[PDB]
Amino acid sequence: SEDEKDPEWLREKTITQIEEFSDVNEGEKEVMKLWNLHVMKHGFIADNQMNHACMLFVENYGQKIIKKNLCRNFMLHLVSMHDFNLISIMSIDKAVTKLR
Amino acid sequence: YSFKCVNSLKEDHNQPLFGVQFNWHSKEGDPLVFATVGSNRVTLYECHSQGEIRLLQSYVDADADENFYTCAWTYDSNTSHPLLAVAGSRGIIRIINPITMQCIKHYVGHGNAINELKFHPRDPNLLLSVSKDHALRLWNIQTDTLVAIFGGVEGHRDEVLSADYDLLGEKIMSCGMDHSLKLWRINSKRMMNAIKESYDYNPNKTNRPFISQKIHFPDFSTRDIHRNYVDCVRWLGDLILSKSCENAIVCWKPGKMEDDIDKIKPSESNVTILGRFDYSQCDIWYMRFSMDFWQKMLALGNQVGKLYVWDLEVEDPHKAKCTTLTHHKCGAAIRQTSFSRDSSILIAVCDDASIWRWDRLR
Amino acid sequence: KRVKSEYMRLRQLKRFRRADEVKSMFSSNRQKILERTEILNQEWKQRRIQPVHILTSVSSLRGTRECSVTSDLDFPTQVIPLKTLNAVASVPIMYSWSPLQQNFMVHGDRECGFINDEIFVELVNALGQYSDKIFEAISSMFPDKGTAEELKEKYKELTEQQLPGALPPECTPNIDGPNAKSVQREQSLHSFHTLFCRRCFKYDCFLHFHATPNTYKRKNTETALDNKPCGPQCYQHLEGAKEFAAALTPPENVEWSGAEASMFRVLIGTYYDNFCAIARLIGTKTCRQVYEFRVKESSIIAPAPAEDVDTPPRKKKRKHRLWAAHCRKIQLKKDGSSNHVYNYQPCDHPRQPCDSSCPCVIAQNFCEKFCQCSSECQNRFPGCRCKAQCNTKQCPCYLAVRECDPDLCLTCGAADHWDSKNVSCKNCSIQRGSKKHLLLAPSDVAGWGIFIKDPVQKNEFISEYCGEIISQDEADRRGKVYDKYMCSFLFNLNNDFVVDATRKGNKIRFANHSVNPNCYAKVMMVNGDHRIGIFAKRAIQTGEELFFDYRYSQADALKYVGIEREMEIP
Ligand SMILES: Nc1ncnc2c1ncn2[C@@H]1O[C@H](CSCC[C@H](N)C(=O)O)[C@@H](O)[C@H]1O
């Protein structure tokens, strides 16, 4: 196939652009990275997916979230998600359950 | 500075000549043999006393109607036999072993004309080729596998011609008509991993074909060095020399003076310009110069056949005390220059199929 | 000339130091060169090298050519027979490029550009040494004549002191950071809002200020409001405190960090009432003294609106034939030309309805789910409700530009099992990206081409011609280069943007052209991004090479694609 959901060089291409921005702190800069990486890993398109995807994501790297100490920064990301009407109320609850 | 034209030769083919190289991979007392490539002819010669140069084996590309462009000596650890790889307009690599009379390793996959052939200082099994397709593909000759490719999508939007290994094969500096001055670190932990499995891969062991890596991120890039077509760059230890159509010689180092090459990041954009050995009457590109084995003695040809010689002693471009040699007969077009494995013998090749040998009054 | 000399010298102080510096590193380079060259030369000593061997005559190849290499000097001319080199094939010329599947949007003159401010500081040194003759002496050389009268300008120009730098001017660290200030809710969200792009619901969508202002409002009373004394010290467990909560619709010695107060400010904007959820979200503080903190916050910060709406329309009066009639109105106005394809743009209608001033209406296009037009916008596509699958003429999706939305073609299983490759629909593969397995081999017609490993039927999805988003003007400039090089990896996406495939693309860009090809090309329109789908005209079997019509002029056809490779049978 020589092709997948996401060719490699794009990943390195985008993360370099991630560090280009200045007004974003590194703690809130890394949360940009792994979020966008997993999205392009699966290529979701619809609203149904991201409600499931966040639960998929939180279990996928929740332990990694502990090491990088972005648990609280990720919460603000989830807060923005509901502001975008893209996430439900209970989905926030289950995230903390997987988080801890 | 102390030199004189002791021998002069000329190919009877009258074809324009191309890259010439000296067998640096030799031993004390070995014959002082250098090689030469024309359009389709490949040939070698040995310098001798009294200006003698006996002719050696010469082969001809009777099939591929294309102009050879680059060549470089090769060594095999298995048979202890020297070899030499060549390429040209068609961009296909032919590596001939003089002992076996022929070439057996064939390398195809590059696109347009290959314009660089130059091996890793440490491993003779490694050869990175540069062609008009902007590709920095490297071949593991001993294993006959493709190795990790540099550049690509984020690399040079224009053709690349010049590339150099440093003394230790630590980093690869390269540039082309793009005027982009990009280098890639060999010491990147990822690629040695590929290098290791490269040396022992076998497609017969598993169906899974080899996976060469693709690299699109230099350790540094810039384009403020030259407003005209850069045609030559070489590793000057920690510094970077450059040549361009503008008849100016500029050596430089990345960032500031205190900025180390290995400590630098890809995001860096500062440059420290330090070279001022300008010249003249050589406005055309495709020129190529050479250096001595010990990185001491520098000599440059010219379109008008003149010589532009310098040293790397305390003499620095602060005043640029040049030594501009010139031969009346050698005036048509100097295509390629090559030092021997010493400061005494140098081989100069003119475009008009003619070879001029200069020796030092040591 | 002492002042002129000093101005020369003052510049030279840095210059000769550089001359000292370059010499100093030169010695360091030289010793390293001596270090490296000697180290390398040691192995050169160890590696035994076979001396050269001379050529010998060949009895079977006595007919080989012989070249007599002339000697320009007194040395005799030397001859040697030639040897034919190896014969190898050739691969058609191509340029390096890299795979992708989405889309992507996108000298050497002068030195130092200006009079360096270093000389101004050197002029400041001429100022700091400080009667009137000095002021005139400073005034003598510099264009900014530094007299005491103009020294006032020098000090004012010196008030800049230091550039602010490329950093967030406000103290807005990561909230996980211990130094996170009491950043208000919107300022913390401001960074995310700018970076986020809901079009692909990703941050920094490098394929798309073109973002929603999110200034909207939404219902918040969906919470169950199941009050219970479940938190020993909670909003419950105190009748006065719990009753006081009904009025809104002193904490203990515990204190809250400035970072905590920031996300306390953030949390209220979500629920406005759910202090219980605050306890589970952050384990540092119990609901009591947080409920009480919100009591303090409610007394400090103005109360939230918490307004709910139902809209005057409840149901009916919205038949989709009116939409088609509304589409008919747009169609007869300007879509009759069917040539001016404007890419979708998110229109903003914060208060105005979907009037004729709607940018999509001007752009003869439908509003989308991302449009700031309300949920009652009479331009958005209704859906793809066809029972069998959104793939045939009857279905509005297949007739229109719209690829069937994952959330709209409900009957064709658009949203259902998006992970599962197979689905009833045949107008959502591009949504899923489910391509075919194309093959690369040197095309028999010309150079490279694109082959197929398996049979494929007509009127069904083939791999999408992905590439790079670029405007017309750059396309002609780059195309002029490609026109000089005869290359044509350009595709007329719409009248407003072009997609080019030379530098970046996927495999199918090597497909050759034919006047009657087995495969065709049709622009599709999906999810707010125009793309170009590729489909086979007829039934195909294993191993057939792919071709499609470029749709160039006949003069350009012979100019570029004059090879067709098929005569008439009779
Ligand atoms: N049927 C055809 N006959 C002649 N040229 C064609 C052609 N179809 C495409 N081309 C040319 O091919 C160019 C695309 S690059 C592909 C060329 C060729 N397939 C190769 O790999 O070498 C276009 O600029 C177009 O001019």
Residue numbers in the entry:
A (entry chain D): 583 to 682
B (entry chain G): 80 to 441
C (entry chain E): 17 to 122, 158 to 181, 220 to 297, 304 to 344, 431 to 751
Give the published text.
Polycomb repressive complex 2 (PRC2) is an essential chromatin regulator that harbors histone methyltransferase (HMTase) activity mediated by its catalytic subunit enhancer of zeste homolog 2 (EZH2). PRC2 is the only known factor that establishes the trimethylation of lysine 27 of histone H3 (H3K27me3), a chromatin mark associated with transcriptional repression and whose tight spatiotemporal regulation is essential during development and differentiation. In addition to EZH2 (or its less active homolog EZH1), the core PRC2 complex consists of suppressor of zeste 12 (SUZ12), retinoblastoma-associated protein 46 or 48 (RBAP46/48), and embryonic ectoderm development (EED). The binding of EED to trimethylated-lysine-bearing peptides is central to PRC2 activity since it allosterically activates EZH2, a requirement for efficient trimethylation of H3K27.2 Upon engagement of specific methylated peptides by EED, a flexible loop of EZH2, the stimulatory-response motif (SRM), folds into a short α-helix and stabilizes an active conformation of EZH2 by bridging the EED ligand binding site and the critical SET-I helix of the EZH2 catalytic su(var), enhancer-of-zeste, and trithorax (SET) domain.
To study the mechanism of EZH2 automethylation-mediated activation, we set out to solve the cryo-EM structure of PRC2 engaged with a substrate nucleosome in the absence of H3K27me3 or JARID2, and therefore with the am-loop as its only source of methylated peptides for possible allosteric activation. Cryo-EM analysis of automethylated PRC2 incubated with nucleosomes containing 40 bp stretches of linker DNA on both sides resolved two distinct species: nucleosomes bound by a single PRC2 complex and two PRC2 complexes interacting with one nucleosome and with each other in a non-symmetrical dimer. We additionally observe an unassigned cylindrical density contacted by a positively charged surface corresponding approximately to DBS2 in PRC2prox that may correspond to double-stranded DNA and is absent in the PRC2 monomer reconstruction.
